[PDB]
Structures are given as C-alpha cells and as structure tokens.
C-alpha cells in the first residue's frame, strides 16, 4: 500500500547503490594489435584472443573466447599464435610444450618438447603378409611382400 | 554535499565482492576478506561461504582438478579422471562423465625399435619428427 513520506525521510524509504567502478581492464578497439591470450572488455564481458590479430579487423566472434580465470585451457595447435615458453598445446592429440618464445609459423618439431613411452602397435598384414610383432621384441616390421 | 538526490560516491573496487546471493559458476572469481578466491563447482544462491569450495587464487599457477559431476566446463578445459588426462570437446553442463564429450585421451607419442626386413626397409623410430618411412 502507498503510505506518505515526510520531508528528509527519503533515505529511509529508498536505498542507492555505489558509484560506477573503474574499467580497470582495457577496452577493445580496432586500432590495436593483439597477441595470443590478451584480455579485453567488450559489451560488459571479458574476452581473450586466439590468434595474432592485426589492427583493422572488426570484432569477429570466431577469434575471441570468453574469459574464466579459474579454468585451464589446452587449445589445439594453431599456425597464427605467438606462443610463450613452456606453453602447452595439442597436436594430433599429442601433448607438447614450446621451448622458447615462438613467433608465428607452421609446426616445427625441432622447437617443441615431447614425452615418450614405449607402446604396442596393432598389426595386420594384408598384401604385406607376415606383418607381426612390435618394437619391444625388436619385431615391428616382420612383414614381407605378398 | 548533502546531495541525497544522487547516489553516494563510494570507493572504487575492481574485483567482485563475495555474497550469499550471486550465483557462481566453476571458475568465477570473488574477493573475500581482502583475498581473492576461485570457485570449484556451480554454486546455487544462498549458500554460505563454505571453505570446502573456494580455492586461493594465484594467477601464475596451472591446475588440473579432478573431474566432478557438478561443474560447467568450457571447450578444451582439462580434467583428471582415473589418473588420465582429458580435454573437453565442447562446452558442457553439469553431469556424469562420458567418453562421448571428453577427448578420449591426450597422449604423448611412442618410440619403437625398427626391424629391417629382407624385402623392404623400415622407418626411423616413429618419433614425431622421424616418421616411420618404409621403402622397397
């Protein structure tokens, strides 16, 4: 129900928020180059990059990604980023780590650390009859021409 | 200056302050008691500040938390399950684990002791750089 309000009694009947907080994070703008993994605000939501963006491109939704500080991402290998030392990345489903600061370019195994473990490759022979064994017993290529 | 007509100019803060009302999702960041913490699971509103759900935040870190059933995950988020490394295929809602979504495995790359046959030669150890190349 509506009830009167006296003089100066306004603050009791209504409450006011606080002034606007500072935009501590930078603001997206097409006049800036961006490297892999930077941070920007746009429309009240934080975002991060996925590739070296040259200035002038509009805000393509395919480039950026939502930013959630508590997550751990392992993006698939890409031919555009500028990765940092000890940077994780997925290639052909194989984990890897950069060795130094890498400028863009095609994948080059010479610069990426790898972990290794022995395995047991499944083998069938078909027209390469007698394909059998693996690398343990030193018999990975038992096959012969059929 | 007595301007009640206007909102009260308050101090400026650049990190969300915890509350009992705001709903949080796995990974959100809050400021509590002058310290920064991070969520561990989707928290419905009204819950108190249970100490078993918020981890101390340290930006330089890098974590691989165990898989859960009450979390929301983004594409390519990494999780540990049965002592194995998994990565999500697409953003997921809360739910039990299933191989369909998560990347089957993240693996390393084998090595092998090649055998030279009498008809065709073998490769070079199957390492990512020297692929196993055979000739006649």
Automatic annotation (TrEMBL), chain B:
Q: Report the locations given in the UniProt record.
A: Virion
Entry's transmembrane regions: none
Its name, as the record gives it, is: Putative tail fiber
This protein's species is Agrobacterium phage 7-7-1
Q: Which portion of the entire protein is included?
A: 12 to 147 of 587
